[PDB]
Design a binder for these strands. Structure first.
Lengths: 269, 115, 115, 276, 113, 116
RNA sequence: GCCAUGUCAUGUCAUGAGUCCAUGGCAUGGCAUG
RNA sequence: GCCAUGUCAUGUCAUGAGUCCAUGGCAUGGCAUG
């Protein structure tokens, strides 16, 4: 219960959720040992290198991470499509996001590496800093390799706690639903071949402006509706619903159709 | 009062209303075959299975049932309404509405012309 | 028994059925406004005149009237039916269909299997 | 089995592994319903569509498939690198592999669609045919949604059986998956210590680079005048060079020759690349 | 021939490193007491050091330093000073583990050859 | 106590230590072949002559000799040490360290630590 | 290779009440951004 | 956007016994195949 603008202003936070513990110190050490620390040691066999640094653990953890999030959202959104599910999952397992969770636990400060992590002129700083993500994944792998049976549920509980705010934030960022039949409806009411009733895309979605504008028009250019949306389909649907709401207008074109000989009526000319 | 745009929608609505009920009585089995189908589903073809999670088939079966049981009442004349229609009969053709009821509504609107 | 292609038609028909009745109650006036309009046709928009010559408009009004007089019964049920549907409710949602009505019928199809 | 080459030939086959079974018919059916069957039904809400066809299940299945394979190969190969683990995993979860598994259960013949699956002029035939792979994953998804507790182990044992031949073929015959363990990572160094000096221009040349058709490489170890002291072949230029080095290290009469040659040359000329 | 140039330079190199290495160990390594204390309490060991405990090299170092502190070194100690007791004009073994008895036993095993 | 940069030097030093002894036993003759070579030098290749002046070759030969006599003792245990190492054997793999030798040491750092 | 969103072409199957028209589903491929 | 294998450029840290040489690790990016 932390409004943090009331009486909770300087009070200690219950965040981040308490980290599950890796009881094998051999393993706990290893999650934090980056390869730059290992592969330059000439007296080590390749086998000894692999069992030293964290790359195996990152691999295993990355799989558990993706697994646990995937069940989580599958259950929490029984009516989500696969694309919705897949897109939502991207926010949860992304580099930026895992990186964040990592810093939360100061894994970035505990990671043992061979080069200067704080150098701001280092070329490590204009890349993805994927290492910070890796060490977090490696922690999951360590927990799993340590005691897979007892620790998988603890990981579920833990990751569910980390995941909840990120989800709530994505789902917000309901109302009436789209009639997939609206364009049909309109054509039924006022439409005929010579009206050349058609849709025009005034704006196609772009990275800068992820929206679209569709105008519903008759042959002579008159706009009967405008709609705005995520893609051309949704926008067109919303244009139609716009046109369907203007009843004075509908009645006008319906009366017009009724007046045209079906000889001419049924032609695009 | 009445507008053209409402009229073309009404004719279409009424037409399909009767046309829809017709199709149902023709195609749908009564409620027992429905119950047998839902009470097994292992000899029910897979493509028909999602249909059992939805309301349409049960309601379809229930209506077909009311038909076999001749409690249809209101809906049989609906199917019969068109042949019972004549322009020079100024009286309601549905007998679930008696002219005691009309009175209530007619004087109700002189009442709203008084508003 | 049930065939895939027929099931799609029933489901669809049931949908058109409910949506159609809904449209009627929404758009249509009751029998008083209907009679007023048909009895003065010089003051109604010229394009609707043939519609007045046909049954739908009258049937639509009669049904709308039935609604106002709360004698809908079954039709009110049909529109509420989806909202009352539960797969885990295994007995009929219609109150005209009683566990006292569904004897005659299930035992008639115990009669039909053996012939 | 009792290999079918031995005296009981007509005995029933051990293949494919017994399919774990989905007890809820609602779910078992949904696995085989492709969306082409559904999305064309105009009387369905979007919500009803999603709960009808198999795409939610395909999604769930792909993850469990990918998770279980990951654990399986992780535990079976404790000394594999991440790249090795990742390359091996690609063999297990590929479109082709899953598709093949799908046909194994005749899932492709059970899949309900709205168009002709057997039409050989259909443009469906010149694609990846990913639908077949999807339904197999959807089956796994079906299994989880049905009884997540009891079916996860059965999925485990079932897939371990499916994977064994695929793994076994790939560890032996894949180049990227081979063992680097008897390589001396100090070999090129060892060699330079023994015979090397700057003006000898001892260098490694790549005579063949790995290609899609031929994933191997050949590196020759040479001195300035062109003489080849060694040859090696391996997955990449690093490995090949290492084996070229090891080749040279085994020729001891040659090594002795060059060591003496060095001893006879004055430090610079010796310490210059081009004594000019 | 017996000795080849290629064999000689590797041998000189190996002997040099051999001596240099044992010295570094005795210089740097604690004895087994410190080693054992570290392995029985691993939570107080800095993490980059933990993998060292799974590998043989550190224990061997500690065990060698141990032999040293206990003055059981001897073969290894003689080696570290060997260069300094080497003289081209003393023709017999500087290792006292090679007595005059072992020597002729060998001469006649290759004299039989 | 143990320091990281010192550990790296230790591990590496030990590896060279072992590799070096192995190479010696591998390449070197025993003391008889050494003595013959050092005593007829016009018959050995010219290039090895300075090495015969130095200690390395003779020391290698002496070690190779001890090997042939089976008086190796400690040096054989060292080359075998790696494959006999096990993390759950917590006792000395060198048998010259007696369970008896251990406590003079457990206690001298026991008294050494208390003046601390 | 693989994924999302966006957009376009061809084949095909549906939907609609004025249809020589109109609206979508699927399949195969293209291009853009990530 | 992302993954594997391969190959190359810049920066940096190591390794080696003839070093004005040789060989590798990492980090950042380019290109190819899947």
């Amino acid at each position: 219960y932390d409004p943090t603008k009331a009486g909770d202003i300087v009070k200690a936070t219950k965040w981040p959720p308490k980290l599950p513990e890796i009881q094998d110190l051999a393993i706990r050490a290893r999650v934090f040992i980056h390869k730059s620390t290992i592969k330059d040691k000439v007296y080590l066999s390749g086998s000894e290198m692999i069992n030293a640094h964290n790359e195996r653990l990152e691999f295993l953890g990355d799989s558990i991470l993706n697994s646990v999030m995937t069940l989580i959202i599958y259950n929490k959104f029984p009516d989500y499509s696969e694309g919705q599910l897949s897109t939502l999952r991207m926010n949860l397992v992304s580099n930026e996001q895992i990186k964040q969770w990592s810093i939360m636990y100061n894994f970035h400060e505990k990671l043992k590496t061979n080069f200067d992590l704080k150098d701001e002129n280092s070329n490590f700083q204009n890349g993805k800093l994927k290492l910070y993500a890796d060490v977090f994944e490696a922690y999951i792998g360590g927990l799993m390799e340590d005691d897979p049976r007892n620790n998988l549920p603890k990981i579920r509980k833990w990751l569910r706690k980390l995941a909840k705010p990120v989800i709530e934030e994505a789902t917000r960022n309901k109302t009436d639903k789209l009639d997939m039949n609206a364009k049909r409806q309109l054509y039924s009411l006022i439409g005929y071949a010579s009206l050349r009733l058609h849709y025009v895309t005034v704006k196609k979605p772009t990275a800068v402006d992820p929206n679209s504008i569709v105008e519903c028009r008759v042959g002579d250019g008159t706009v009967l509706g405008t709609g705005v949306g995520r893609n051309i389909k949704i926008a067109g649907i919303r244009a139609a619903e716009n046109a369907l709401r203007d009843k004075k207008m509908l009645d006008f074109y319906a009366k017009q159709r009724a007046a045209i000989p079906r000889s001419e009526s049924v032609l695009k000319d | 009062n009445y507008k053209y745009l409402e009229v073309i929608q009404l004719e279409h609505a009424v037409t399909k209303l009767v046309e829809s009920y017709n199709k149902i009585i023709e195609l749908s089995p009564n409620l027992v075959a429905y119950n047998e189908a839902v009470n097994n589903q292992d000899r029910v073809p897979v493509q028909i299975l999602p249909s059992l999670s939805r309301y349409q088939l049960k309601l379809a079966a229930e209506l077909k049932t009311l038909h076999d049981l001749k409690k249809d009442a209101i809906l049989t004349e609906i199917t019969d309404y068109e042949n019972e229609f004549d322009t020079e009969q100024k009286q309601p053709i549905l007998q679930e509405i008696s002219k005691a009821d009309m009175e209530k509504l007619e004087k109700l609107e002189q009442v709203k012309r008084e508003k």
